[PDB]
C-alpha cells in the first residue's frame, strides 16, 4: 500500500522527470535489454540497437503510461485497465519480467536524479513500480 508519504515522494520525483520521461523510458529499456537478455524474446520484431527509434518510441509509451499512473495513483486499476487487458490477453509477458524493467527504471532514475534519489525516495519508487506491476498483471488468469 502506498502511504501518503509514498505518494508525495513519487509525485515529487516524477515531477522532476518532467519532459525527460520519454528519454528515460528508452534508456530503461536499453538497460533492460543489455542486462537481462531474456527480455529481448518479447521484441523479435524490433531493431534493439542503441539509438533505435523503435525503442525510443516504445520508451515514450511506457513513460507516458507511468505518468498516467502517477496522476491516478489513488485509482490505478481503472486508469491502467486497457493496458492490463493488453498485457494479459495479447502480449502475455511473463510476470517475472516486470521486476526486471522496474529495476532498470530505478537505475535510470538514480543516474539522472542524484539529489532526489534519496533512500526514502528510492523505497517509495520501488513500492510504486511494484504496484504498477501488480496492476498490469492483474488479469493474467
Amino acid at each position: 500500500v502506498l502511504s501518503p508519504a509514498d505518494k508525495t515522494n513519487v509525485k515529487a520525483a516524477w515531477g522532476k522527470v518532467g519532459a525527460h520521461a520519454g528519454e528515460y523510458g528508452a534508456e530503461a529499456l536499453e538497460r533492460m535489454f543489455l542486462s537481462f537478455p531474456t527480455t529481448k524474446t518479447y521484441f523479435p520484431h524490433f531493431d534493439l540497437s542503441h539509438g533505435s527509434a523503435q525503442v525510443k518510441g516504445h520508451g515514450k509509451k511506457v513513460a507516458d503510461a507511468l505518468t498516467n499512473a502517477v496522476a491516478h495513483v489513488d485509482d490505478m486499476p481503472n486508469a491502467l485497465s486497457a493496458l492490463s487487458d493488453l498485457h494479459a490477453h495479447k502480449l502475455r509477458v511473463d510476470p517475472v519480467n516486470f521486476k526486471l524493467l522496474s529495476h532498470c527504471l530505478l537505475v535510470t532514475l538514480a543516474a539522472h536524479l542524484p539529489a532526489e534519489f534519496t533512500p526514502a525516495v528510492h523505497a517509495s519508487l520501488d513500492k510504486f513500480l511494484a504496484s504498477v506491476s501488480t496492476v498490469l498483471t492483474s488479469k493474467y488468469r
Binding site: 537478455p37 531474456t38 527480455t39 524474446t41 518479447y42 523479435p44 494479459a88 502480449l91 502475455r92 509477458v93 511473463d94 510476470p95 517475472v96 519480467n97 493474467y140 488468469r141
Partner: protein, 146 residues
C-alpha cells in the same frame, strides 16, 4: 549435473514407469491451463478456449509428446545436460523467442503431474531429485540465450 547415485536412481526408476506420450500431453495441457500466458506461442493450435478444449487438443498433445520425448532422452545424459541441449537452447532463443521462464513453469507442472500420477510413490526425496533435474534441464535450455 551433480546428483548422488541415490538421486540418479530415484529418477531413472520412476521414469521407467512413465507413459511419455501421456505425461507429455498432460504436462503441456496443464501448463496452458494453469499459466494461460504460455498459450502465446500456440495460436496455430486452434481451440484453447477452455480447460477441456486445451486438454483435448490434438496439437497440444502432439507438441507435449515432442517436448517430453526430448526431456526423456536428456535423462540418459544427466552428466552433460548443457552439451545435450545446446542446439535446442539456440533454437528456442534465436528462432522461437521463448522466455526461459516458461521452462521453469513447465518443470514445476511436470513435478505436479508426476505427483498426481504416482501418488505416495512420489516421496519427498524423489521429488527433491526431480526438482534438481527439472532445474538442470531449464538451465541447460537457457544457457545459449543472448
Amino acid at each position: 549435473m551433480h546428483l548422488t547415485p541415490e538421486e540418479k536412481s530415484a529418477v531413472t526408476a520412476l521414469w521407467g514407469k512413465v507413459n511419455v506420450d501421456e505425461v507429455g500431453g498432460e504436462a503441456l495441457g496443464r501448463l496452458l491451463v494453469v499459466y494461460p500466458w504460455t498459450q502465446r506461442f500456440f495460436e496455430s493450435f486452434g481451440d484453447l478456449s477452455t480447460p477441456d478444449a486445451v486438454m483435448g487438443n490434438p496439437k497440444v498433445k502432439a507438441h507435449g509428446k515432442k517436448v517430453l520425448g526430448a526431456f526423456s532422452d536428456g535423462l540418459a545424459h544427466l552428466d552433460n545436460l548443457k552439451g545435450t541441449f545446446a542446439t535446442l537452447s539456440e533454437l528456442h532463443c534465436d528462432k522461437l523467442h521463448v522466455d526461459p521462464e516458461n521452462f521453469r513453469l513447465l518443470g514445476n507442472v511436470l513435478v505436479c503431474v508426476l505427483a498426481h500420477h504416482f501418488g505416495k510413490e512420489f516421496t519427498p526425496p524423489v521429488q527433491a531429485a526431480y526438482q534438481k533435474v527439472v532445474a538442470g534441464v531449464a538451465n541447460a535450455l537457457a544457457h545459449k540465450y543472448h
